[PDB]
Every structure is written in structure tokens, then in C-alpha cells.
Design a protein around this nucleic acid. Sequence first.
DNA 1: GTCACTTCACAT
DNA 2: CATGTGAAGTGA
Length: 113
Amino acid sequence: DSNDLEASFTSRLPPEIVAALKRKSSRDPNSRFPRKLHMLLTYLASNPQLEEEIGLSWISDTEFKMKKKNVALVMGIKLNTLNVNLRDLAFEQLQHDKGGWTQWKRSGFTRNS
DNA sequence: GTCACTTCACAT
DNA sequence: CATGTGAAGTGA
């Protein structure tokens, strides 16, 4: 069931976003992590049901929160990886796992860019 | 040859 | 349980 969970998600998502997320990372900035993540972020804050189901959103305009299990699902990237990226591209974990949720920030990460 | 992730298989 | 390691891929 941890797979079909993927289905409903990717599926109920606009083909463009998906497409985005599917492309391997190149030197192109809107192809590496941050962007890809961030597009979802702001996409979601636009369609609440999904913001709930996936569990990825802005707490403040500087900090945000997610259920890794789930974002790493949408992004087709394993959980392990997803964490590995978060610290590797320097994101700050500022509140240990609180029942699935975590909140984060990154100096360049915010509002819209 | 380099990036920028990815994943594993175990460690902490 | 949640997270991180180092080495070893893979295709931009």
C-alpha cells in the first residue's frame, strides 16, 4: 500500500509538477532539490486537501513543515535520501520529529524563491 | 572528468 | 523509533 499511496498523489497532481519532479538533477537550478521541493510547497498552499494529505506547508513565511514519509513519497525519492538532501543542501531541522511532522528553514528558502 | 544527487547497509 | 555514514552508482 506504500506504493499506491504514491499513485493517488502523483496522479491527483498536475502533469507539469510531476514532470518537474521526475527529471534527474543537472546543472539547471530548477532541477536540483530546493526548487523541486519549493514548487510543491507553494503549489500545495494553493490546494489544501493535498496540503493535508501530503503534509507539506508553510508555518511561517520563513519556516515550513512536512511529513517526510510523505514528501519523500511524492518526490519518488527514498526517505533516507530525502533526509540526506535536507542536511546536505543545508536545511535546518529546528524541531525533532513530533509524530510524523517536522518543521524547517533555509536562508534562501522562503516566500517565493 | 564533474555535478548533483541516489541508494545501500549499517551506524548513531 | 528517527537520522546519519562512507563508499559506490547514475546520468545529466
